[PDB]
Amino acid sequence: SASAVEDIRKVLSDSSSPVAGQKYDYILVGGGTAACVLANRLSADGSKRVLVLEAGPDNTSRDVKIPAAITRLFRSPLDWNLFSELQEQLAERQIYMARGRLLGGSSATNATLYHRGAAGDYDAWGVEGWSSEDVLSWFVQAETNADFGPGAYHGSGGPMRVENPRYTNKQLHTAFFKAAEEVGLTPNSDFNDWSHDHAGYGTFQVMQDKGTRADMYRQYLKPVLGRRNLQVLTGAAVTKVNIDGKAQALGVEFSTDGPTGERLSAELAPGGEVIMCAGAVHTPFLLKHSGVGPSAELKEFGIPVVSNLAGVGQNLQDQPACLTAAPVKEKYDGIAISDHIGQIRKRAIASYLLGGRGGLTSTGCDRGAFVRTAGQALPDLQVRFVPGMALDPDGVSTYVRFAKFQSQGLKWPSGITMQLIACRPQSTGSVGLKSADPFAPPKLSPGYLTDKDGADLATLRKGIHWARDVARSSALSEYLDGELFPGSGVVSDDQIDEYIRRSIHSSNAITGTCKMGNAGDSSSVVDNQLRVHGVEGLRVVDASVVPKIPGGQTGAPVVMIAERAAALLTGKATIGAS
Numbered sequence: 001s002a003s004a005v006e007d008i009r010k011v012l013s014d015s016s017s018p019v020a021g022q023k024y025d026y027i028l029v030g031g032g033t034a035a036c037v038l039a040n041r042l043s044a045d046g047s048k049r050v051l052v053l054e055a056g057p058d059n060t061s062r063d064v065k066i067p068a069a070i071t072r073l074f075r076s077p078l079d080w081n082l083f084s085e086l087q088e089q090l091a092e093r094q095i096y097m098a099r100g101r102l103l104g105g106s107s108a109t110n111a112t113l114y115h116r117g118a119a120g121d122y123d124a125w126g127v128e129g130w131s132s133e134d135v136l137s138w139f140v141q142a143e144t145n146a147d148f149g150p151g152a153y154h155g156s157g158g159p160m161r162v163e164n165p166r167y168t169n170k171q172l173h174t175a176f177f178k179a180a181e182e183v184g185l186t187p188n189s190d191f192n193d194w195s196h197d198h199a200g201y202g203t204f205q206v207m208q209d210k211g212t213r214a215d216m217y218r219q220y221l222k223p224v225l226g227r228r229n230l231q232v233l234t235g236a237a238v239t240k241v242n243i244d245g246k247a248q249a250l251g252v253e254f255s256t257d258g259p260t261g262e263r264l265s266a267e268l269a270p271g272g273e274v275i276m277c278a279g280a281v282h283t284p285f286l287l288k289h290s291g292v293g294p295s296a297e298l299k300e301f302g303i304p305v306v307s308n309l310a311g312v313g314q315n316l317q318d319q320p321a322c323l324t325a326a327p328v329k330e331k332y333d334g335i336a337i338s339d340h341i342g343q344i345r346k347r348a349i350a351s352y353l354l355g356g357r358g359g360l361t362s363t364g365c366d367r368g369a370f371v372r373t374a375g376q377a378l379p380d381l382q383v384r385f386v387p388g389m390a391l392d393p394d395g396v397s398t399y400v401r402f403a404k405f406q407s408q409g410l411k412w413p414s415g416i417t418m419q420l421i422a423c424r425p426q427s428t429g430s431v432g433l434k435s436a437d438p439f440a441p442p443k444l445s446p447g448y449l450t451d452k453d454g455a456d457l458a459t460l461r462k463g464i465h466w467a468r469d470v471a472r473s474s475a476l477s478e479y480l481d482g483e484l485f486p487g488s489g490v491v492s493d494d495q496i497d498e499y500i501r502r503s504i505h506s507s508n509a510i511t512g513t514c515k516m517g518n519a520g521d522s523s524s525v526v527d528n529q530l531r532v533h534g535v536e537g538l539r540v541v542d543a544s545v546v547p548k549i550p551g552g553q554t555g556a557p558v559v560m561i562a563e564r565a566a567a568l569l570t571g572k573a574t575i576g577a578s
């Protein structure tokens with residue numbers, strides 16, 4: 001009862017650890033996409049104390065809410081700023097792999113876009129309880145659209161928010177659809193509907209609420225925040241899972257204020273259970289540091305091997321991208337133009353916010369196609385059509401320069417871009433360790449254009465040809481001032497292949513590093529129930545768990561694995577046979 005004791009021990013030491021004295025039945029590593037879902041679900045019933053440990057800040061930024069601000073988000077303090085390893089097969093470089101560092105995670109860094117892919121994508125897995133039939137229902141739990149309400153295929157009621165994009169106000173969007181209608185039999189589609197083929201031109205539905213970003217923080221965690229049940233720790237960087245014959249998860253080592261550690265431990269109640277949600281990048285990284293991974297890889301930096309699972313960090317699927325762009329003949333107007341000059345509009349600030357949301361509702365690349373380049377079982381090619389002209393052959397770093405475009409501006413040249421993605425790529429990469437330091441970046445190699453048969457490079461080369469075909473269509477050629485971006489200089493197949501490879505970039509959909517398998521799956525990391533093989537009380541509920549990357553983008557399937565898993569964990573639902 002002094003004043004120095006009343007301080008240097010009370011207010012200070014009590015405030016030192018926010019986890020001292022407890023006792024949690026769920027500890028979520030990461031406050032990203034799936035984590036947000038899980039926190040909502042496992043905290044709903046009042047009885048189970050749930051803790052989420054996110055390294056980033058919470059999302060309060062206006063740059064998250066307004067979707068056109070995606071550009072400002074890219075090489076920012078809100079991104080993990082991950083760069084890969086020198087890719088020999090990609091002419092030196094060094095590939096940037098955007099990832100969210102934030103509550104809501106990557107769903108807050110998102111290009112929005114709602115894709116489930118194809119029924120076949122899910123059937124192609126090691127299906128012990130995870131067939132297209134099994135997973136459809138959970139897709140629907142959430143949904144909530146302005147595109148039907150019965151559906152089969154589309155629900156309403158759950159917290160996700162999908163809609164057709166509130167900006168359209170173009171004649172370049174119509175120009176694209178007509179150009180696609182020509183250019184060879186491409187029929188219209190309205191995706192996610194597994195009655196439909198999947199291949200075809202159309203609009204992508206956006207993960208937005210009347211033009212505002214509907215990330216998983218906003219939709220799952222924010223309303224459920226301030227439940228006595230739920231402790232959300234922001235700025236908390238996880239170091240490892242604390243483990244144990246029978247390897248047993250005990251909790252999680254973490255650190256507020258980083259490398260100047262003070263290594264705190266979150267403690268598990270007699271129940272379970274630590275569940276990983278750090279993403280396809282950071283989940284395998286953290287597990288390797290927790291001692292769960294390829295032995296020898298773990299031996300290399302002297303960490304005790306628990307489990308020994310060769311699968312962790314392996315089977316990284318990212319779906320790479322390239323680009324054709326072109327300016328318009330004396331038609332200076334949109335989309336660059338529908339919100340620039342060289343300085344931000346004006347009208348568009350009034351259209352977004354208040355006005356029920358106009359252009360700047362964004363993103364770019366809202367609309368496009370799924371295409372079979374060589375009559376594959378499923379479309380190998382994704383086309384993303386932007387009604388703006390790219391100024392770099394790396395689409396990501398075009399966006400970065402677009403954000404860096406204010407007050408210095410002349411005028412953004414004004415035109416169109418077609419981004420070409422290999423949806424269901426054959427090449428794979430890996431996520432490893434670079435040192436014994438859990439605060440070091442995790443050593444990525446995406447392994448683009450790596451497959452034996454050169455299938456990825458092909459699908460992408462044919463994509464360029466497809467794009468040019470479209471550009472030369474009666475409808476588009478009307479608008480276009482020709483000569484493209486790739487260049488009239490790049491004509492041969494070898495010259496296309498040097499261009500892509502010099503220009504290849506990420507369409508930002510990384511999966512599969514802790515893949516779910518069944519029975520005796522030697523390359524798998526988790527079982528049927530998303531367990532983790534060598535360790536009890538530990539699971540992954542995460543993009544990392546995806547056996548084969550599906551067709552479109554990845555958010556939607558992640559917020560589905562999270563739903564289904566949360567249902568499994570809280571009684572409510574089973575997976576497989578008892």
Ligand SMILES: Cc1cc2nc3c(=O)[nH]c(=O)nc-3n(C[C@H](O)[C@H](O)[C@H](O)COP(=O)(O)OP(=O)(O)OC[C@H]3O[C@@H](n4cnc5c(N)ncnc54)[C@H](O)[C@@H]3O)c2cc1C
Nearest residue numbers: 030032033034055105106111112113238279508553554555
């Ligand atoms: C630029 C970009 C655009 C995209 N566009 C689309 C799109 O248009 N449509 C679509 O469907 N999908 C899109 N995606 C994909 C989708 O956002 C992700 O696939 C999905 O969010 C992955 O969910 P996750 O559970 O892995 O969440 P993540 O958000 O990857 O969760 C990881 C979280 O864990 C935290 N974390 C990491 N390490 C630690 C640690 N050591 N301790 C504590 N916390 C940690 C991170 O801060 C992060 O918040 C895009 C992705 C990117 C990067």
Ligand SMILES: CCCCCCCCCCCCCCCC(=O)O
Nearest residue numbers: 111364388389390395396398417508
């Ligand atoms: C809304 C800005 C429009 C003007 C800039 C031109 C568009 C750039 C080219 C399109 C490729 C898009 C790459 C983004 C990749 C991603 O979002 O994950």
